[PDB]
Design a protein around this ligand. Structure first.
Ligand SMILES: Nc1ncnc2c1ncn2[C@@H]1O[C@H](COP(=O)(O)OP(=O)(O)OP(=O)(O)O)[C@@H](O)[C@H]1O
Ligand SMILES: [Ca+2]
Ligand SMILES: [Ca+2]
Ligand SMILES: [Ca+2]
Lengths: 368, 127
């Protein structure tokens, strides 16, 4: 795709990679962040769906874990796939914006920069914090983003355009933990969901039929007494199963991590705790601008429940507002697309010239 | 090595006491003709800088990004980012304000001596 120079935007997640062209309203390519290599022989590698489909002869890996890159060689393959198989561009002809997790380690930031300029020869690149790009995408410069994807959740207070690093909180509770938990409770129901193929079916049940109850205990109660809210689901073979209270018990784990045997605070309390680490004078603007982002915030009912839980935690006169854009699976990517399209972004990129002068450590001064 | 906006409108921003208004138009910051100040297209987003003279000789800045009820996501996202950029350009000195149609602060409404007006329509989205 391509105005004058056409910038690209890549949003790398633990579970999914989202890639596209600056200026579009959605990512053109959305694929699993998975790299497959031969269990025995042919060097060779597969990415995404194609890796998944030949999984029986490959060793599959995830180069990003809890939002952080842990394998650079496989991260390069995601990228090579992104440029050549998905977007079909020559990376040397485009500025590339990339996203990272809040608090990404300093050396990781360098490495990303180094790979772009030295392996792909990008003419220019930029690194942006995922959570800040969603805030921007919702048309705000101050607020708190609760970003939850497949491998990590974060609460990130932002003020006048920048994250407040001391108040950011991380929670290793996300989508994958939820799919796993639905596998386990559906299995207790009397079904059997333990394999890989089954995990994928379960991920699909979770995304189609799960929801967050507004009142957990009243719901458990309504289901104990009536059948009216149960749903059918057809498996790939035509067998039909019935889903009862698993529908809301699975995402309840976001609010009650004990359900997964975790001792941490739920997303509502993590949000509260981040707000309380900020200066008292901005808190009002945090509570008033709670932005939800990422695939694991897509459960129906989640905004209302977050509204209720924060209301119960904060002083009764505090004005709370939960914003949950319908496109929030792609908010990060969309924010990046907007940012990189601006007539004023030109000077913000790291250019090849700047890289050749300072090296990878240019990233700590330019991508703030 | 640095990251400084060279846009011609940043060079004019906040040079002297007064009111400056820009509309977001397909990912750019475009001045509004001064004879049109106070009339806002509800299908658009705008950036407003109010510059006031301080006794000290320096200037006070309030930056307001106004969002019409039908503006597209690229417009409200650009208005916000431009606001951050203008604040940075001005050494962090501006106080930022998010103004939503139908809910603007009294200070913002007080800038339009003959009363802010809304009109339907606007410029098409940049996406
Ligand atoms: N409709 C849905 N309801 C609930 N969960 C969903 C829905 N759609 C997607 N998800 C989940 O969102 C997750 C992927 O979302 P996302 O792209 O935002 O994460 P990521 O960026 O890959 O991971 P992370 O941000 O943790 O690094 C998966 O766990 C997927 O099952
Ligand atoms: Ca993500
Ligand atoms: Ca418009
Ligand atoms: Ca400021």
């Amino acid at each position: 795709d391509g105005e004058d120079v056409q910038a690209l935007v890549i949003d790398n997640g633990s579970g999914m990679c989202k890639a596209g062209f600056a200026g579009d309203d959605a990512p053109r390519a959305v694929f699993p962040s998975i790299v497959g290599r031969p269990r025995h022989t042919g060097k060779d590698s597969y990415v995404g769906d194609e890796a998944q489909s030949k999984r029986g002869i490959l060793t599959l890996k995830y180069p990003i874990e809890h939002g952080i890159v842990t394998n650079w060689d496989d991260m390069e393959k995601i990228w090579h796939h992104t440029f050549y198989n998905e977007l079909r561009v020559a990376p040397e002809e485009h500025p590339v914006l990339l996203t990272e997790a809040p608090l990404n380690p300093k050396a990781n930031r360098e490495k990303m920069t180094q790979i772009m300029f030295e392996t792909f020869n990008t003419p220019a690149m930029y690194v942006a914090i995922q959570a800040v790009l969603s805030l921007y995408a919702s048309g705000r410069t101050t607020g708190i983003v609760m970003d939850s994807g497949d491998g990590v959740s974060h609460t990130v207070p932002i003020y006048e355009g920048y994250a407040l690093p001391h108040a950011i909180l991380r929670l290793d509770l996300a989508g994958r933990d939820l799919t796993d938990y639905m596998m386990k409770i559906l299995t207790e129901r009397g079904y059997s969901f333990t394999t890989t193929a089954e995990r994928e079916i379960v991920r699909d049940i979770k995304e189609k039929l799960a929801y967050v109850a507004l009142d957990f205990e009243a719901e458990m109660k309504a289901y104990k007494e009536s059948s009216a809210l149960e749903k059918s689901y057809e498996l790939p073979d035509g067998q039909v199963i019935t889903i009862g209270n698993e529908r809301f018990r699975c995402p309840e784990a976001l609010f009650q991590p004990s359900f997964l045997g975790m001792e941490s605070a739920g997303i509502h309390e993590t949000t509260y705790n981040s707000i309380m680490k900020c200066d008292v004078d901005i808190r009002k603007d945090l509570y008033g601008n709670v932005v939800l982002s990422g695939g694991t915030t897509m459960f129906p009912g989640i905004a209302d429940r977050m509204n209720k839980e924060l209301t119960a935690l904060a002083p009764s006169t505090m004005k709370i507002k939960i914003i949950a854009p319908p496109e929030r699976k792609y908010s990060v990517w969309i924010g990046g697309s907007i940012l990189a399209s601006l007539s004023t972004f030109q000077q913000m990129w790291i250019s090849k010239h700047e890289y050749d002068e300072s090296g990878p450590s240019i990233v700590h001064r330019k991508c703030f | 090595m640095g990251s400084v906006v060279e846009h011609p409108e940043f060079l004019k921003a906040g040079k002297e006491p007064g009111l400056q208004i820009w509309r977001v138009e397909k990912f750019d910051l475009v001045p509004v003709p001064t004879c049109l100040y106070g009339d806002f297209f509800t299908g658009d987003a705008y950036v407003i800088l109010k510059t006031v003279q301080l006794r000290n000789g320096n200037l006070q800045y309030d930056l307001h990004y106004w969002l019409g009820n039908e503006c597209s996501q690229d417009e409200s996202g650009a208005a916000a980012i431009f606001t951050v950029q203008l604040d940075d350009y001005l050494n962090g000195r501006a106080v930022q304000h998010r103004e939503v149609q139908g809910f603007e602060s009294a200070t913002f409404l007080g800038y339009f001596k003959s009363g802010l007006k809304y009109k339907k329509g606007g410029v098409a989205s940049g996406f």
